[PDB]
From a paper:
The relatively large SDR family catalyses a broad range of reactions utilizing NAD(P)-dinucleotide cofactors. This robust enzyme fold is known to accommodate a wide variety of substrates and thus yields metabolic functions spanning several EC classes from oxidoreductases and lyases to isomerases.
The enzyme crystallized in the apo form, with no cofactor or substrate bound in any subunit. All eight chains can be completely traced from residues 2 to 254 (a total chain length of 255 residues). All eight chains align closely, with an r.m.s.d. of 0.3–0.5 Å (Cα atoms). In solution, the native mass determined for SDR-WM99c was consistent with a stable tetramer, and no dimeric population was evident in elution traces. The αβα core is extended in the case of SDR-WM99c by a capping helix–turn–helix feature (helices α′ and α′′; Asn197–Ile213). Helices α′ and α′′ display relatively high B factors (ranging from 146 to 203 Å2), indicating dynamic mobility in this region. These four active-site residues are thereby identified in SDR-WM99c as Asn117 (α4), Ser146 (β5–α6 loop), Tyr159 (α5) and Lys163 (α5). By direct analogy, in SDR-WM99c the adenine ring and the ribose phosphate are proposed to engage α4 helix residues (Asp66 and Val67) and β1–α1 loop residues (Thr14, Gly15 and Ser17), respectively. In SDR-WM99c, such a cleft appears to be located between helices α′ and α′′, i.e. in a markedly flexible region of the apoenzyme structure.
Author numbering:
A (entry chain B), C (entry chain D), D (entry chain A): 2 to 254
B (entry chain C): 2 to 255
């Protein structure tokens, strides 16, 4: 089995979102041990109990801000002291907003760009230090977005940040190959979530459906394949790429 | 198992190359039935026997020119009459040469471009008609090359044809979605093969190795994961993309 | 004046089209000499007179098929014997159609792909030999289309050939640089011309307008700048690129 | 003359660099008025006198940090109060460094990413408000780098920020079309300047020269054509693009 991730430790940021939950559950279901973090601890204790109960894998929870480097480092040290080495980092931290181009302020910018671009970078740096010390030839997966190359209205800093992370992915792959660490991205299209429930089920968003070739928004399960590929031996010869999962959304006329 | 291909029928063009053999053996090992074709049938006979004996799957062989539309059409008819419907087409036919930009002629151009771009298009058209006829929601995988976006010297018609195929993959993904058929590409880097042993093991090619981030040419095994992804349920939400498998070669420092 | 093209010889294939007429008139206006070819000599005679009369530059006409290498070569030899050396090749031969993906046949494929991709390649080879023989460091400009990276319905072989020509432009730049020849592309969006008046004035085309950021189809004049840039000293440090002229069409949400 | 910029006001950030001086002189030479800023007012005065003396155009200088949003805003208000309206914003702000991937710290990141990406975004926002207030249909030009899509070692945050700026250019193009403002980028390759004498004039860098198809580093003059195209009427039908000026470097094998 080339997609085997059993007994690995998967570190997942942005773990309290619907996507964060799905990812953790996917890897626990495949027999991987899970390290989940988010800003607020209470949402993770819940996910933790469920995962331990359903799958019996090891689960570690950490509350921290992904932009707090010393917090991430302190998380890794805490893991190292318990004898744990991270195999795969999944950078899934992400915030956005909807504002006209001229209405975004410096505060909006710092929040969106630091969360979507700076934080994955910091986290990758620290996890890589940790992997290198343990001589572990792991993997890094960046959750980007089709908005890293496609555009939409009202989401300018998000687009900027995603595009930055996509190119950073390529550069990281080039600079980290010497440590045997591959670095790749997965770019989802529009996923049906509650943060954009009003938007998608509306009539204006329903017209989007008719532009998307599969006539369907992205389901979490659509991500399963690429996630397992990029986190396992199956993906070891692959580095520096971005896999779009969008039902052809980005290729539409 | 979301990567399940058991009992599917996989159609593989260009099956007589080392890569084609590898692909055939990969899907057979995963319990899938195999349809292989190439120009010379005799080049397929060992593989058929190995596969029947070792994996116990169905194997159909066909001799044809990938540029012969009626031959492809006749093959598909023959499969239908045996109750066989193709689940996945893997377009893996590919030729090249090495010539200065100005030394390539009309004959070279027609050979390289018709084989690399026109034939996969013909096969896709015919396989799609066959799938539709059987009301089947299948998959198409185009083997391109990192040369669909990167350049090299002495391979201009190959680069043009691969970029052509890459964009056609995207266009087909859009136009075929209505039939439940997803269309994707795999772009290998330089694979350690025997048609290019001299190029790769030489001085000019050994300098190439140090440019590649992993400092390894592409192994056939590197392709297994993407192939299984794009041929199975795991990949159903994915259409119109090209997965590069190159150890970072195309990202390498300018 | 870095955009100077006075006294150059500009070779324009596809000269009988609306765009071809426009390009010819553009360069004549700038004091450049004009070599135009198309299949039917009579459509070029009107253009020839119009140009000779208004601008007083040299005009050479050739009736020939652009897919005929021997004809193209004889045209050049003919020019060489008169002491004329081409400075700029503008590859503007291009035909298309509108058919469902499964309705395009082998004949459609050959006409479309040979004219849009094979011919500019043949002409480029022949023009380059002509330049090399005269020890001349000229330019090649391939007219592609935004459909070289974007998609639309019913134009599958056109898209393939344009994407092919786009990458071919990059490869040619690399391979012809040693002869001092730069190679670039201009990719127009949907041009308000007479060859696609029905598509654009239809309702499927009116829905296009509100999607395009400038709310305008492309005017021929929008190409003037890129044409003069890539044909003059102004463009000498530029090779291997494709300039999109489309009012943001390829970036639209 | 479709490239006319006579009497326009061109706003140039990063004006104290070698490139900034060149851009100021280019536009002054073409009869356009110049608004230049840099951190230290003293570095701008030499240029100011030279331009006022040689071309006799209006020159306005401002000391500011391009990351200081309120200072940029005050500059524009100051200009508004004098009856001046900016026609073209040229974002020419850019800093970098050389460090292995894991050696870059939070302070480096902030300096590089805020200067290369956040600042042009702030300036663009402020300048658009200024244009809209004056009902003026101008242009924005972002100086990116071929490193917005290509990679190199030791420059990871620069790559991120430039890729960020590249996609932001496309997004802004879409969102600002409604105001008659086009947004484009110029991506130079490696420029032979005095600020980078060691990497380039040495032999370690000389192996790159053999990689570049033209065998030439980028000269400032190579940018002249694209700059005038994108700042004038010649470029009005163009929005959302990046013009690479690199002698085919990014296309190299």
């Amino acid at each position: 089995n080339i997609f085997d991730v059993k007994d690995k430790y998967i570190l997942i940021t942005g773990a309290s979102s619907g996507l964060g939950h799905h990812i953790a559950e996917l890897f626990a279901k495949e027999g991987a041990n899970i390290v989940i973090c988010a800003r607020r601890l209470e949402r993770l204790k819940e996910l933790e109990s469920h995962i331990k109960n359903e799958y019996g894998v090891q689960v570690y929870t950490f509350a921290l801000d992904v932009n707090d480097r010393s917090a991430v480092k302190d998380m890794l040290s805490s893991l190292e002291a318990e004898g744990v080495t991270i195999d795969v980092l999944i950078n899934n931290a992400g915030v956005s907003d909807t504002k006209r181009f001229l209405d975004y302020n410096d505060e909006d910018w710092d929040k969106i760009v630091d969360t979507n671009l700076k934080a994955p970078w910091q986290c990758a740096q620290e996890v890589v230090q940790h992997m290198i010390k343990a001589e572990r030839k792991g993997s890094i997966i960046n959750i980007t977005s089709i908005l890293s190359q496609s555009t939409n209205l009202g989401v300018s800093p998000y687009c900027a940040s995603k595009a930055g992370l996509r190119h950073l992915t390529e550069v990281m792959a080039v600079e980290l190959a010497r440590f045997g660490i591959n670095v790749n991205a997965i770019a989802p299209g529009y996923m049906i979530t509650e943060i954009n429930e009003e938007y998608l089920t509306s009539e204006v968003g329903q017209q989007l459906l008719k532009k998307i070739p599969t006539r369907k928004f992205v389901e979490f399960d659509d991500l399963n394949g690429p996630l397992l590929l990029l986190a396992s031996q199956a993906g070891q010869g692959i580095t520096g790429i971005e896999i779009k999962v969008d039902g052809g959304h980005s290729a539409a006329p």
